[PDB]
Amino acid sequence: MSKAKITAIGTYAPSRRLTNADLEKIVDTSDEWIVQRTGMRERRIADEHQFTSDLCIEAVKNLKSRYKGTLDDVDMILVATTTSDYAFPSTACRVQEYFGWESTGALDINATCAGLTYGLHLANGLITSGLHQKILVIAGETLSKVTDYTDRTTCVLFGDAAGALLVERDEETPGFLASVQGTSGNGGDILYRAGLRNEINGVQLVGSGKMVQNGREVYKWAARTVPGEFERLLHKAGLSSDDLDWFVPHSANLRMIESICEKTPFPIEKTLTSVEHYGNTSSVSIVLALDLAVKAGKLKKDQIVLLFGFGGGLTYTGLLIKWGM
Amino acid sequence: HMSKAKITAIGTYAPSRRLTNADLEKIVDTSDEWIVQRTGMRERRIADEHQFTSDLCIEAVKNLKSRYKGTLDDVDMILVATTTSDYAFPSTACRVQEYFGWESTGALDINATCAGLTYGLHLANGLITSGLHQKILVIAGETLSKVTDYTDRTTCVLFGDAAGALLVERDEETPGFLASVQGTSGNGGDILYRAGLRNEINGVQLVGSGKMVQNGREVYKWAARTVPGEFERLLHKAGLSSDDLDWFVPHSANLRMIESICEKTPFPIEKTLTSVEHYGNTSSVSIVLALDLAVKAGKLKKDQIVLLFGFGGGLTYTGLLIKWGM
């Protein structure tokens, strides 16, 4: 029985846009090919000098300007990212540096594109257990700096952004209704970026440190995993799909989301995305989709939302939440 | 707000190659005597050229499993505290799942530097007490030798490689977690860092070369003023005195630093478990190693009250009062 609720949101995307017309001019592709395979038209790119922590701070500033309460109260900062400024100090510690909160834990977490829903799962457990009260769950990514822009199959997908969600103790009405998780470690060679190691199964990695994906195998894994766990979520919470107001999967690819929406029985018109003008922002994709929906009037207080973050690992966390703002 | 979690099993693995003080004498201008005096370390373990953090972690879960009476097939969460993961986003935790093939588990890497172990247990306690999980593996693993500058005598003598795992599960009888304290000093970020995508910090270009960098004096100063008062606050939160606590297990960064903390917090060094002498500074792993050294030696017994205090790069920390459930 959850004692946690999501009560504020903020997002920031860097100003520089990367259009398909800009991409036709550096790789051999076309606007029509891109929009047809992926659904994206633009992405935001961080400046040469602005990094993930800079984006996370902006995202929290946006939340700060839009939240009727105070953030001096925050007692945990969770930052889900893959493009941290430094190996350490962590990005969460950079956020604390800037706002100066006096008594908070700070932690970077890594589940790649599932990082946001992993972070919200963590906040739900930390609050519900009575260990925390105000927790900042932040996703921020600088995918442009680890993207192979010599590769037509991948450089058209990725953008930069950050988004922040505030979670609080709510003892009246639960804000988290159910959770599903799973990990398919066997898929680690299907979606990766090199680090200290440069081989997986004794097989040398490609990409020269940049992100690498087997798009079809990722697509196939999402398509065969999300529908059943979608159903399992609704069962765990005692809910029908008719009770579900919005479906917010990880915005990796509009066709993938369309496909998922057919294999699951769920309509695309009840599905929030952010892929068209921000590309695939990894752990930030879901926050962007939510804030676009908040700004557009589609997402309203007390609605039932299903966030399904999945990514590299392969791993995922699916969440049924009740909008609390 | 009573805890429903207890640490129930442990396993460790430290790499094979030993890096003695004598070895370091032929690498940089240092002496065995200056090292044992300034840091208390004699040996470190070094991973092989082709073994990495995920290898170490898997070896640590192997050790735990060969020592746990129950099964690990129903582990529902893997948390790996690491700063030196094999790959950027392929999660070390997911490499651990791939090896053992557990069927329904979350996998997540966490980064709080040398504080990652205590942060990972704090997470596990909240994840289990809230009823979202039943059995969690909290793993720390580091391959610091791969990110160490072996032309800097002030830093390359400090670090080693190791991995250690703790199992946390539901215990509705008696809590295994009694109190927690946390804190973050983001402005101390330039005191202990390693370059990632960025190579400047508030204006000034980073040093090293993607290798770990530490201001040992300032790290000493922080924590010497931080840990004693939070030590006491942990006891107050749990309703205990210094005499109720059996073992103190701080981050094994430096024996002089540990002795000094024990000096200005009122707590005796003979009641503190360390692992610096033969394993060096293994970052997030140092506490698990001190724990596993104490159980093998018969010093850490079940139901004993023990305080873990992980502090590290951030600067950030998590301190925990726990009851040994093994």
Query: Does residue B69 share a domain with residue B154?
Result: yes
The answer, yes or no, to whether the previous bond of A89 is cis (omega within 30 of 0) is yes
Q: How far apart are CA A322 and CA B292, in angstroms?
A: 43
Q: Based on the number of CB atoms within 10 Å of its own CB, is B239 exposed (0-12), middle (13-18) or buried (19 or more)?
A: exposed
Pick from A93, A112, A183: which is nearest to B106 by CB? Answer: A183
Asked if A76 and A96 touch (Cβ cutoff 8 Å), the reply is no
Looking at the structure of chain B, the number of domains it has is 2
Contact B89 A77 (CB under 8 A): no
Q: Which residue of B has its CA nearest to A80?
A: B110
Q: Is A204 helix (H, G, I), strand (E, B) or coil?
A: strand
Query: Up-side HSE of residue A163: CA atoms within 13 Å toward CB?
Result: 24
Helix then strand then coil, % of chain B, to nearest 5:
35, 25, 35
B291's CB contacts (< 8 A; 6+ apart) are B10, B164, B166, B249, B273, B300, B306
Query: Does residue A235 share a domain with residue A205?
Result: yes
Resolution (A): 2.4
Contact A196 B52 (CB under 8 A): yes
Asked if A46 and A142 touch (Cβ cutoff 8 Å), the reply is yes
Q: How far apart are CA A131 and CA A76, in angstroms?
A: 10
Query: Does residue B212 share a domain with residue B122?
Result: no
For position B244, which CATH number holds?
3.40.47.10
Residue at which a domain ends, from A116, A150, A169: A169
The closest alpha carbon to B90, from A134, A66, A205, belongs to: A205
Contact A313 B90 (CB under 8 A): yes
Active site residue A186: no
Contact A125 B122 (CB under 8 A): no
Query: Does residue A140 share a domain with residue A188?
Result: no
Query: Does residue B192 share a domain with residue B138?
Result: no
Asked if B301 and B214 touch (Cβ cutoff 8 Å), the reply is no
Report residue A298 CA to chain centroid gap.
19
A145 CB near a chain B CB, below 8 Å?
A: yes
Residue at which a domain ends, from A144, A169, A194: A169
The boundaries of the domain holding residue A83 are: 4-169
The answer, yes or no, to whether the previous bond of A288 is cis (omega within 30 of 0) is no
Longest CA pairwise span in chain B (Å): 56
Q: What would the two tokens of residue B255 be?
A: 């024996």
Query: Does residue A86 share a domain with residue A202?
Result: no
Query: Does residue A287 share a domain with residue A163?
Result: no
B83 CB near a chain A CB, below 8 Å?
A: yes
Report residue A146 CA to chain centroid gap.
17
* Chain A hits for B93, Cβ within 8 Å: 183
Contact B186 A129 (CB under 8 A): no
Pick from A51, A104, A192: which is nearest to B87 by CB? Answer: A192
Please state how this structure was obtained: X-ray
Query: Does residue B201 share a domain with residue B255?
Result: yes
Size of interface A-B (CB pairs under 8 A): 241
Query: Does residue B257 share a domain with residue B137?
Result: no
Query: Does residue B106 share a domain with residue B224?
Result: no
B97 CB near a chain A CB, below 8 Å?
A: yes
Helix axes B216-224, B227-238, angle to 10 degrees: 30
